Amino acid sequence: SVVVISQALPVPTRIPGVADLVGFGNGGVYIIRNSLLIQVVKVINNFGYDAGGWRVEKHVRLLADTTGDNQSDVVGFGENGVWISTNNGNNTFVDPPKMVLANFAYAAGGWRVEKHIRFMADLRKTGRADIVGFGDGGIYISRNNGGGQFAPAQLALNNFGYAQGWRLDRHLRFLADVTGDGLLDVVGFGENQVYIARNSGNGTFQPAQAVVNNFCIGAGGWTISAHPRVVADLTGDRKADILGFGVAGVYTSLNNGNGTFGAVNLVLKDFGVNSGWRVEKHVRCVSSLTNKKVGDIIGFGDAGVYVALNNGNGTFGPVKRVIDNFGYNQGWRVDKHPRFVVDLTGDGCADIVGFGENSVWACMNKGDGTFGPIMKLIDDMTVSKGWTLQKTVRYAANLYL
């Protein structure tokens, strides 16, 4: 499906695609290129816990194409500014990184991981990722003007900021195209309403408008600790819908096609609190698993991975356990073992990857939402090889096409 940026998954992956694995480890940045040779390559002696002083609680580390050549660069929101290591095209990156803007940082603009959100996104159809932050006064953007030149930060909209009452412990903020013009709009699950703000394509967003009185902490009792929510295309028209894992199960509100939204319906009595799903034990994702290229539901539960396939119209088929692994009963832990649903094979049907206690493992989609056997990738980038979730960042990312 289509480009959505969320707090949980700030580095989108392509469908179809052959995603790479990237690790910000103790010693710097390491990649596992998706290829016939599976190996770890150290590419930058920076952006690491010891190699550079990078901290999850102070800094943000992402991958984004900042030049327009469809190669992803490493972008870090560091201590005193934004630092970028560009992709050299050959599984190497520039080192040291370049400081492109003294803003959006812990000691340049007072940015705080616990109050603010920092993304990279092509907001103006230039082919290059601009810097986008949900800061104190609103949403701020720094335009990527090319050749590493980022312009001084401009206020894009005086909303969705900490000053307006937006809180990471209560609310959710996304970027997603809800209108179909290819521009990423803001979607914010506020106190009482889901709000959208249309991207005008010029570095600003239009005034926020409420679309749904549900999916929020004050409207339906949706909490961060218990009820995950996503935005995703559930019908194939490339416009994002709203999906939440609530108490009884999965609730949706479908986009009418113009950024207006339908009623909230319970579409599947599974994957919710009443079926025993718990944010601290389980992982719940929406990704395309089939040739319909719509959002299907994937849950890493107790006994393994469970999937319900979208019929193509936002209704769902039966829940099936597709692999007896990657689950809580197999020792997988949200606090220790990152798990992703991403295309690793290029067929457009997302696959599973997880960074286990000892090894990285994958399980490949057969093409129809059913899965093959578990496969070992490599014995690195794991707990026992010195990667603790709290001192490292790991992503699936398309470094190259």
Q: Which residues bind Ca ion (CB under 5 A)?
A: 177, 179, 181, 183, 185, 343, 345, 347, 349, 351, 365
For residue 80, the partner it binds in Ca ion, Cl ion, none, with Cβ less than 5 to 8 A by kind, is: Cl ion
Taking the complex as a whole, the smallest distance from the CB of residue 95 to Ca ion amounts, in Å, to: 32
| Residue 270 or 343 having the CB closest to Ca ion | 343
- In angstroms, the CA 120 to CA 211 distance is 25
For residue 79, the partner it binds in Ca ion, Cl ion, none, with Cβ less than 5 to 8 A by kind, is: Cl ion
Taking the complex as a whole, the smallest distance from the CB of residue 222 to Cl ion amounts, in Å, to: 37
- In angstroms, the CA 36 to CA 118 distance is 34
Residues that bind Cl ion (CB under 5 A): 78-80
Taking the complex as a whole, the smallest distance from the CB of residue 156 to Ca ion amounts, in Å, to: 14
| Residue 78 or 190 having the CB closest to Cl ion | 78
| Residue 130 or 343 having the CB closest to Ca ion | 343
For residue 351, the partner it binds in Ca ion, Cl ion, none, with Cβ less than 5 to 8 A by kind, is: Ca ion
For residue 78, the partner it binds in Ca ion, Cl ion, none, with Cβ less than 5 to 8 A by kind, is: Cl ion
Taking the complex as a whole, the smallest distance from the CB of residue 371 to Ca ion amounts, in Å, to: 10
Taking the complex as a whole, the smallest distance from the CB of residue 325 to Ca ion amounts, in Å, to: 17
| Residue 185 or 296 having the CB closest to Ca ion | 185
| Residue 65 or 351 having the CB closest to Ca ion | 351
Question: Which residue of this chain has its Cβ atom nearest to Cl ion in the complex?
Answer: 80
